[model samples]
Target: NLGSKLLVGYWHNFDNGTGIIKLKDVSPKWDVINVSFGETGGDRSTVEFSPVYGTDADFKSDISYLKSKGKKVVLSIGGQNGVVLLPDNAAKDRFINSIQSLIDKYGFDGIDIDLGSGIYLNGNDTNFKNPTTPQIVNLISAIRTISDHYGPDFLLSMAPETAYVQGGYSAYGSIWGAYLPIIYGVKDKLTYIHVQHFNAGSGIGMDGNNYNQGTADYEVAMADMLLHGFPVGGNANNIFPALRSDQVMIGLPAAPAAAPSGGYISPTEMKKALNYIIKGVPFGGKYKLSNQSGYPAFRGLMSWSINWDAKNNFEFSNNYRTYFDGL
Candidate 1:
């Protein structure tokens, strides 16, 4: 089960310098443990994952242990380097079947789609309202099919970067707002979405201004667009509807080493932004929320990693977990 205010973290299946720990050893503070990735198969259609640091039995037991603790342990597909392509019906079928098998084997609570960039053809596939790319269309169908098979209780989450989400405010074509179509397509089954608000450099917020990471303004501005909804590609007529406050979580890197690029906000700075979003605290930022009262029902924070935080003495975990729990 998820907490009233969640602290979601991605647990690495493969260690990339970030210390690896079995899933069961992940901090109890994490309400959701997203197993880092479901690697793309040789064909680049089907998906699979294995414990890089432990035996399969160990991971299965650890997943069970976490679930028993009322944590939502789900398999997250795609990483910064892993690219998955669902180009046709057959490919979609393989993707769905493989994911289902993994879910069955692991007893996962659900799935989180973390595919970024390459999956959807940026230059070729324009129009978030009507994505014509076969890959984009097929991916949506596969997700719907999986959700249908598992039914409503299954948790379905997504982790798209800000460029794929908030960038729609500036332009819809290309990779700018690419994720909107998939997100809108699966909005019904989507349990929650935590857009990666880091490593993206800067993006155009709803205020028509560029906001960079590491500051409270950047976090709040990017997050508010999803909460308040916005005109797709700046087209006032084609407005994207707002998601429920409970369905949105602001994603950030747990530490500087957690991400390859910039966008690591310190705890003090992050708190200033979170205070503005979660509480109705007055924001002393460049861009102001349309709603001053704020989204008290707003979900919670999601970090790029659990391992990085663990390596950093659980600075991100303790700070935010205590903050959310204390609320």
Candidate 2:
């Protein structure tokens, strides 16, 4: 979603000891490459400072290779078991400084927040107006502060799960505590918000009805909640605002086998949903509010990882790029 209807795919440095290529050997089929998991060091209070994730030598050349192919390379922070936090102002200060350092050291074009287990959106509630969700405000608050320093092209993205953004069609905090509040605060600074369409069991669509994940129905429904603004119902008191098409993207597993249960939408079926979102055209029964609002130029697609697609010989990239180009 950074430019020209992007196709973002994450690549981890780990050798899983399989067919996946290392960072140096990765190809540039994806429009944007998110070299993932800037995780915790011994402190667990700051983003990791490992050079090239200790994957290989002279990784800077690999990033240059991706850039030469017109792919924007961003750093993906936090992972499945990521453990980093800001329990106080000192920690917060440390976070900002260290993240900036990582960006400088690796020459990243941007940063993607993939806070999975190391959730920070849980700020507390004694102050109602400020809320108690520490994970929500402090991190996003720091983003915009650092945003201008990186200049306009410095990409800022988030890949939160469905429950965080959709939250039964309410404001970001409605579903327990999440990074949605941060997304909203930093939307103007964000290149895109690629919410994961995989691994999500079920989520509420714009119609306020719950739908299963993996199918076009859930994909469109979930994406709808972001583009179509709604009143924050339930425990949420703040009104939710809508985001521009370019900043809202749909994310799914690169291969059908990547996820444990659901999330593998075919481009043929996926476009039917995309058409509905783009022009209010519905097919296959349609999601409940399928025709209400549309975003014809809505950003584009993002997949789980480039390494997984590499294992499958670029099937996902080849097929989806064919479809997105026409759009």
Candidate 3:
């Protein structure tokens, strides 16, 4: 089981600018380590993932070593550069088969759905409650089927951007709020959702307030909406229920370089925002929480990549761990 406050970090399977590392060497601060991306090719539906650096034997052994330490190492599907588009039953089947194969082979504790461009609204795919997009429908079914097959111990998670999730408050079509339906579809089996607070643009909160990135209010409001349920596209009748405190985490970049496209919040402001969310500290930010009584049980934080944190002298992990431990 996870701790009261968890620190989740993405462990790169492929080498980006940050140096590649064996999974077993990831920081002990990371309670949940998401292996970044089970990618797809031109045939987006079919997915595959393997360590881009280490040998298969060592990578598989690394996973077991992490598990022995009570760490949850999950396969993260689709990153900024990855995709998985299941448009039909066959595609969905292929997705399940490939994902299951990876899990069985590498012994992943769960799968993290981080499909960036893979999830979007097409023609007549407007309704989040009842989506018409083949990709959306098939994705929901595929996730549910996989979860059912894996049984209760199966850990499932999602790492979506603010636009894919909280952006539903301002609009519910196209890329905006596209993840709502899938979230609703797999609510039961969803272990947690760590929205990429960094890399996100502006977003609207349940308070009917618009917030920009990099500010304490933006991060606070982004989390507040998910912590407390919100109406879908301002429709009070169709409210997206609040996820458990433990099922929510704030995803930020380990360093400025970690997010090349921008959206990195300073550690000071990030801590201020977290203080506002986890404790009832007056943020003095633009957006106010619907629940003034802070969610002290609010799960914890997540970072873009563990390797980036290492490059930055583990500033992200060390600072966050100290804060969470102090709490």
Candidate 4:
């Protein structure tokens, strides 16, 4: 049942102005579908900024269809090429207003803050040394306020940087220690916290060569939060919790070169990874060892996205579907 409770979904991009997708074709086994509002970068479009042209009855119909199929739909906001002008409080307020309007107009169940590359262009330096914690916290606080006003029926999620330590513009001037208190204050207000794991220098064969693999840095990060007395799993405790399990989930991305041969993962490799999690692997310890010492203790896994070509195909395969179903 723990495994059954994990969320398996994709972040989809709709070519048309409408924010909709052919979910049944993509992967019927998937339980959640994240509809990206706009592309990472390029020309600013209505979906990225204004809500007038962006909100369509068709978009709402698309979401309704997904829910009818028993799938969870989350409205994703801010990503690579999307709006990046929110460098100050006023800009953030405006953005929040737009988001609120969208939620009210469209009836979305939640929002995923995907502030990936937008941070750097927004005036924060990418280098972690610069420190951008205060502004980041403030932005989240504002978003939290909006979510609180909406109440528990709606979800507020954040897709944070995937590194051992925070990086990018959001990290500039940020104080690591401050994260605890900030999250504590709004603990009850969040639906989940998605920490990206793909590009975060934690997995094997990511860089030119193997660097952070088996280091258990990922596990350590989560464990450190747990050691700090954060909740084990679920939103109720909220100092720090597994996004899905503790209601605070960790996002795991698929590795392009996951195996030596090439772009796609074979059924074997997929099984290995799933088995590792199901078996209670010590994800963030000194080494990537299988901590098969218990059951119902491990949380969940989040893919970087469900749209990548090769990875998408593999995940949609019957073998992978069965593997996930077995989990």
Q: Tell me, what's the RMSD of every candidate? A: 1.6, 2.9, 1.5, 7.7
Superposition error at 38 for model 1 (Å): 0.5
Task: State how far residue 105 of model 3 sits from its true place (Å).
Answer: 0.2
Ranking by lDDT: 3, 1, 2, 4
Error of 4 at 65 (Å): 0.7
Q: Lowest-lDDT window of 10 residues in candidate 1?
A: 117-126
C-alpha positional error of residue 23 in candidate 4 after TM-score superposition, expressed in Å: 4.4
lDDT of 3 by residue, 67-113 (tens): 99999999999876568888789899999998898888888889999
Identify the runs in model 1 with alpha carbons over 4 angstroms from their true place: 121-129
Q: Which whole-number lDDT from 0 to 100 does residue 318 have in model 4?
A: 46
Q: Identify the superior model by TM-score, candidate 2 or candidate 3.
A: 3
Cα deviation at 309, candidate 4, in Å, is 5.8
lDDT, candidate 2, residue 184? 66
**TM-score, structure 2 vs. true:** 0.89
Ranked by TM-score, the better of candidates 3 and 4 is: 3
Ranking by TM-score: 1, 3, 2, 4
Provide the overall lDDT of each model, using Cα atoms, as 2-decimal numbers. Answer: 0.85, 0.72, 0.85, 0.47
How many steric overlaps are in each model, in order? Answer: 0, 11, 0, 27
